[PDB]
Amino acid sequence: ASLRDIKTRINATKKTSQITKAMEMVSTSKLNRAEQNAKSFVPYMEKIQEVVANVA
């Protein structure tokens, strides 16, 4: 059933698979840096939380 149309549809969805895989990899790297920012923020939050606790 339109062998050429099937093969063009196969190549188009392979291209979308490649693009969404690249975007998955970019979001893995950005997730790594976002959890690095969270673990760099955490000692400030621990210290200000214990100061607010002891004062208030």
């Binding site: 979308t16 923020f41 400030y44």
Partner: protein
């Protein structure tokens, strides 16, 4: 004896060492801190922190001193020992920050144009 200083920002730790005299100034006035000090909390004014030497300019800023925990919670803590260098660093980092805020958005929209054309060709292929 020495006391352990650690100036802490929300972005991360800036300075951490063992300093004999800490000469921060509060909203009321000066404070000269030695090891064995009483536990006290005092908000810091927008000025340098005199550590005896390396001077640390803090912005926002809040001090709590225990006899080993004289740490400083600052919203913005420079290093270059001058009251206006934090303002110059903020003027530079605002520029770098909106350059990054535009770079991230245009990179996402380029990748999304690639995805939208690649799914256009899938929908046209039928």
């Amino acid at each position: 004896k020495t006391i352990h200083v650690s100036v802490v920002t929300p972005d991360g730790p800036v300075y951490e060492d063992d300093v004999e005299m800490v000469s921060v100034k509060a909203k009321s006035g000066e404070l000269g801190i030695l090891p064995g000090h009483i536990p006290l909390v005092a908000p810091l004014e927008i000025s340098a922190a005199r550590l005896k030497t390396q001077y640390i300019a803090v912005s926002g800023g809040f001090l709590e001193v225990r006899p080993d925990k004289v740490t400083i919670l600052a919203q913005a803590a420079e290093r270059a020992e001058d009251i206006d260098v934090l303002r110059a660093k903020a003027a530079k980092e605002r520029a770098e920050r909106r350059l990054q805020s535009q770079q991230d958005d245009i990179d996402f929209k380029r990748a999304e144009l690639a995805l939208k054309r690649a799914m256009n060709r899938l929908s046209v292929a039928e």
